[PDB]
Structure formats: C-alpha cells, structure tokens
C-alpha cells in the first residue's frame, strides 16, 4: 500500500508545483485541467492497483 502513497506524493507535489507555475494567460483552465486530470489518473491507477494488491479470487482457466 505504501507504493500507492509513494505515487500520491509525487503526483501531489507535481500538482502543487503546477498550481504555482501555471501560465498567467488562462490560469483557471491550466491549473484546473491539469491538476484534475492527474487526480483522476491517480485515482484509477490506485483503484486498479489495490484490487490486485491482496486479491481474494485466483485466476482459473482450463484451456492452456
């Protein structure tokens, strides 16, 4: 689970570093598109990583 927190640190620090270094021309759509898309990419990565970190169902097939 700590390799989810370790990715949350480098995503959150990147989003904070982009909040202060956004271009001044279109600030409320530079720091709103890029910071929210990193959040949603990290959310789907964390959900697709934690479902396989400690699984309850093993993959079972016959034809191999």
């Amino acid at each position: 689970f700590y390799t989810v927190v370790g990715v949350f640190i480098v995503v959150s620090a990147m989003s904070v570093l982009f909040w202060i270094m956004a271009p001044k021309n279109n600030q409320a759509v530079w720091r709103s598109t890029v910071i929210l898309t990193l959040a949603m990419m990290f959310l789907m990565w964390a959900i697709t990583f934690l479902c396989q970190l400690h699984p309850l169902v093993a993959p079972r097939r016959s034809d191999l």
């Binding site: 279109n26 600030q27 409320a28 759509v29 709103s32």
Partner: protein, 45 residues
C-alpha cells in the same frame, strides 16, 4: 480578467442618446457588441 471559473462583472449602465445622433450611436453599439439592452417599456403594447 478571465471569467471561466465564475461569471464576468456586469454593471447596468445608463446612456442618454439625443435625437440628433441617435442612429449613429445605435449603429455604433451594434458594432461594439458589448451592450445588452433591457426593455424598459414593458407596460406598453
């Protein structure tokens, strides 16, 4: 400013157009595209 997070700041100004320069001011405001008129005489038919 930009107005993509909230709306822009509106003012409700009041003009006074004389009858000598009336068509010219109206055709100027039609080309400037900044003044949203409001129907003052709603009670008239």
């Amino acid at each position: 400013e930009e107005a993509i997070f909230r709306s822009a700041d509106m003012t409700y100004v009041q003009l006074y157009i004389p009858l000598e320069v009336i068509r010219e001011v109206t055709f100027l405001l039609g080309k400037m595209s900044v003044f949203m008129v409001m129907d003052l005489n709603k009670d008239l038919t």
